[PDB]
Design a protein around this ligand. Structure first.
Ligand SMILES: O[C@@H]1[C@H](O)[C@H](O)CO[C@H]1O
Length: 274
């Protein structure tokens, strides 16, 4: 028996960890696993899924590139009676037997609360959004807005997408720095964007700025120890991958499973890094 793992991109350390979590548990339970990289492209994702259907995989674990666009691939999986579990990001359609992810609205709230307290409830905040087609991104923005709105002297002065990517985080932060001489904090919706923003800030010789990421990647934790990043909202990618395989196993054994499993989040600062 064989599991198909379709991941949005392997250019993000977060997803490399998720991949490794799935692989470790698959060995443990005696499953083969085929991991395929969608390269943030819904077309590559569909071709990846079709390859896996043709290899006769017994279950499909998918981390969608886009909430709507993924439904075609899921509905092809459905037609061939291959069970689908979504991981980290939700699908807006098709039959999905389980979804495993963080409470990303709560994660955005956590980031906002930290920033608002750290800034004594006053200042200019920049938000670097992730891929808009990812539930994770949308949810973090919603939670962040909901929490920061309670602090009227905090103004979100720029809100721009940087596609969960380090390079785009740099370039976007460059532009924002040029357009905004007063920035007191930055929330990036993932660590890769946060690291890119840091590079832009250090390049511009800005001081000065409390940078908060999302994920708890090794590079982020190192940035925090070095004092380049103030905090991150740590996720459990390896556990998400592990649970995905676990629930696949149970489902394949004829057992009913919950249809949603939340993965816990933890705020990480210098005080508790590591
Ligand atoms: O949860 C994940 C991670 O934050 C990753 O860095 C980007 O994609 C999101 O869905």
């Amino acid at each position: 028996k064989t599991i198909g793992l379709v991941i949005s991109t392997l250019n993000n350390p977060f997803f490399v960890t998720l991949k490794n979590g799935a692989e470790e548990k698959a060995k443990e339970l005696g499953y083969k696993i085929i991991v395929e990289d969608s390269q943030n492209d819904s077309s590559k994702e569909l071709s990846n899924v079709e390859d896996l259907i043709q290899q006769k995989v017994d279950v499909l674990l998918i981390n969608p590139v886009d909430s709507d666009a993924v439904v075609t691939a899921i509905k092809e999986a459905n037609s061939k009676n291959i069970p689908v579990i979504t991981i980290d990001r939700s699908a807006n359609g098709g039959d999905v037997v389980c979804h495993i992810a963080s409470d990303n609205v709560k994660g955005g709230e956590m980031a906002a609360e930290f920033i608002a307290k750290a800034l004594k409830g006053k200042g200019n905040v920049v938000e670097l959004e992730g891929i808009p087609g990812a539930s994770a991104a949308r949810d973090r923005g919603k939670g962040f807005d909901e929490a920061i709105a309670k602090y009227p002297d905090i103004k979100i002065v720029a809100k721009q997408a940087a596609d969960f990517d380090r390079s785009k985080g740099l370039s976007v932060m460059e532009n924002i720095l040029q357009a905004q001489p007063k920035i007191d904090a930055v929330f990036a919706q993932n660590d890769e964007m946060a690291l890119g923003a840091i590079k832009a800030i250090e390049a511009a010789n800005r001081q000065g700025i409390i940078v908060v990421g999302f994920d708890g990647t090794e590079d982020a934790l190192k940035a925090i120890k070095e004092g380049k990043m103030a905090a991150t909202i740590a996720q459990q990618p390896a556990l998400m991958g592990s649970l995905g395989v676990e629930m696949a196993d149970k489902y394949l054994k004829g057992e009913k499973i919950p249809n949603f499993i939340p993965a816990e989040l933890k705020l990480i600062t210098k005080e508790n890094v590591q």
